[PDB]
Amino acid sequence: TRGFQSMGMYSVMIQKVILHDVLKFLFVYIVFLLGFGVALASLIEKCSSYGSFSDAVLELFKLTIGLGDLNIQQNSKYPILFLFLLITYVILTFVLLLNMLIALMG
Amino acid sequence: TRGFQSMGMYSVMIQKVILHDVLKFLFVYIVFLLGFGVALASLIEKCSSYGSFSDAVLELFKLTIGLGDLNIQQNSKYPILFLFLLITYVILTFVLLLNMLIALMG
């Protein structure tokens, strides 16, 4: 699609946005993902849903893209603290960081 | 990340947006959240889902971030009024207020 005129300007924007904004945003966002993934997988009392570190980050990525669930009834010792960490993560990335990325991409 | 050049301008934007826009938006949005939380938890006839004030605001925050459900079949006395309040809340915050915040953050 570099042959036409109204398509090369759409095929170079992928390269510009990937090399400038999305990589920088992921280099920031991986820190929040790892921190809240360990912080949620630590306090789960063993037998549920937030099993290990290779599952809590999947649940958090679904929560960031807008899938999944946000159920309070988990097998934790402090469900108020668990809900507070989940609300802090959703406020930090679903509202602040992703829309700041959208403004920078604009 | 203040050491580099293309990262300090990404680490100061979090401070600017948090101190200018997100705090102001939450100071407005908490009023709508409290008002519709009491207005929905008041008219639920006791035995469901909209149990108390500490659960209706959880359901409304899930409805604002785009999770949850919007089922009409609730244990209310006026389901038309309940659905009208829910549609008014979704129109007020999911379409108007959050996208106005996005424009101001841009």
Side-chain angles (χ1 to χ4, degrees):
Chain A
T1 77
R2 72 174 50 192
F4 304 96
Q5 179 180 334
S6 200
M7 290 293 308
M9 328 194 188
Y10 209 85
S11 161
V12 71
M13 279 187 202
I14 307 290
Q15 264 183 299
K16 288 292 292 184
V17 169
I18 279 295
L19 289 202
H20 278 194
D21 303 347
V22 172
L23 177 49
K24 190 183 307 192
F25 154 76
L26 288 176
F27 190 76
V28 161
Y29 171 83
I30 278 300
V31 163
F32 285 124
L33 196 63
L34 155 70
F36 280 85
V38 182
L40 290 180
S42 199
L43 56 96
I44 292 300
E45 302 294 324
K46 209 56 71 180
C47 81
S48 315
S49 57
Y50 292 84
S52 41
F53 182 68
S54 278
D55 184 1
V57 299
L58 167 68
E59 181 66 312
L60 286 185
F61 194 80
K62 294 209 304 189
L63 197 55
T64 297
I65 67 167
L67 290 180
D69 51 320
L70 199 144
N71 49 4
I72 186 169
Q73 294 297 110
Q74 295 288 149
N75 192 11
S76 89
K77 263 301 170 58
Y78 310 99
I80 283 174
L81 179 86
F82 193 86
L83 189 63
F84 164 69
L85 272 190
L86 213 54
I87 294 300
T88 319
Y89 173 69
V90 175
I91 287 177
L92 269 183
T93 74
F94 197 83
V95 172
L96 161 70
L97 193 42
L98 189 63
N99 294 338
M100 209 194 54
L101 169 68
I102 286 186
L104 198 50
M105 268 173 49
Chain B
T1 77
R2 72 174 50 192
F4 304 96
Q5 179 180 334
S6 200
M7 290 293 308
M9 328 194 188
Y10 209 85
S11 161
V12 71
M13 279 187 202
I14 306 290
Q15 264 183 299
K16 288 292 293 184
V17 169
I18 279 295
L19 289 202
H20 278 194
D21 302 348
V22 172
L23 177 49
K24 190 183 307 192
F25 154 76
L26 288 176
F27 190 76
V28 160
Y29 171 83
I30 278 300
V31 163
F32 285 124
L33 196 63
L34 155 70
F36 280 85
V38 182
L40 290 180
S42 199
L43 56 96
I44 292 300
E45 302 294 324
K46 209 56 71 180
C47 81
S48 315
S49 57
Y50 292 84
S52 41
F53 182 68
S54 278
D55 289 345
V57 299
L58 167 68
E59 181 66 312
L60 286 185
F61 194 80
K62 294 209 304 189
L63 197 55
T64 297
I65 67 167
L67 290 180
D69 51 320
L70 199 144
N71 49 4
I72 186 169
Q73 294 297 110
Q74 295 288 149
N75 192 11
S76 89
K77 263 301 170 58
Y78 310 99
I80 283 174
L81 179 86
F82 193 86
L83 189 63
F84 164 69
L85 272 190
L86 213 54
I87 294 300
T88 319
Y89 173 69
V90 175
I91 287 177
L92 269 183
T93 74
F94 197 83
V95 172
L96 161 70
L97 193 42
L98 190 63
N99 294 338
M100 209 194 54
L101 169 68
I102 286 186
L104 198 50
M105 268 173 49

